[PDB]
């Protein structure tokens, strides 16, 4: 059916035009977008943005592939969507994200939402290590500012574990 809201749509649409190296240059941010695939990816942003020109015919295949790679079920497409929905809920519970926002109708949006929450918590740690801001970092700073005033609960728990340098 339809979701009750899509709180991070605007941020998603900004991130969908950025590039992977705008995030991978910062250690905590890199880790933020390395869930759920086990490598840094903007693919869920790309499929969720309202600004990205995509082709509908191949959307369905891309979504299937992303689900299968996330949860590692490849033998049944519907099991893999269940599997990805489970990953979403698992991470959202840890992040303190309200599960009413994530009913599993638009799994691409839901992963990007959870990644946004990860990014906003991760940015604080990179900033307190005095990284050099780029426009990706500034966008995250601005969204946090807006939320601290509007609806601080949308950012979840302040429980990001800092990445340790190699």
Numbering used by the authors: 79 to 244
Question: What are the paper's exact sentences on this?
Answer:
Innate immune antagonism of RVFV is primarily mediated by its main virulence factor, the 30 kDa non-structural protein (NSs), which is transcribed and translated from a subgenomic mRNA derived from the antigenomic S segment early during infection. Here we describe the first high-resolution structure of a bunyaviral NSs protein.
The crystals were found to be extremely fragile, and diffracted synchrotron X-rays to 2.2 Å resolution. The structure was successfully phased from the anomalous sulfur signal in a single native crystal and refined to high quality. The NSs-ΔNΔC monomer, molecular mass 19,029 Da, measures approximately 30 × 30 × 50 Å. It is composed of eight α-helices with helices α1-α6 and α8 arranged around a long central helix α7. We therefore conclude the NSs-ΔNΔC structure represents a novel fold. In the crystal lattice NSs-ΔNΔC molecules were found to pack into a highly organized network of two fibril-like assemblies, referred to here as F1 and F2, creating large solvent channels. Therefore, we conclude that the F1 crystal fibril is not only more stable than F2, but that it also represents the architecture of NSs in intranuclear filaments.
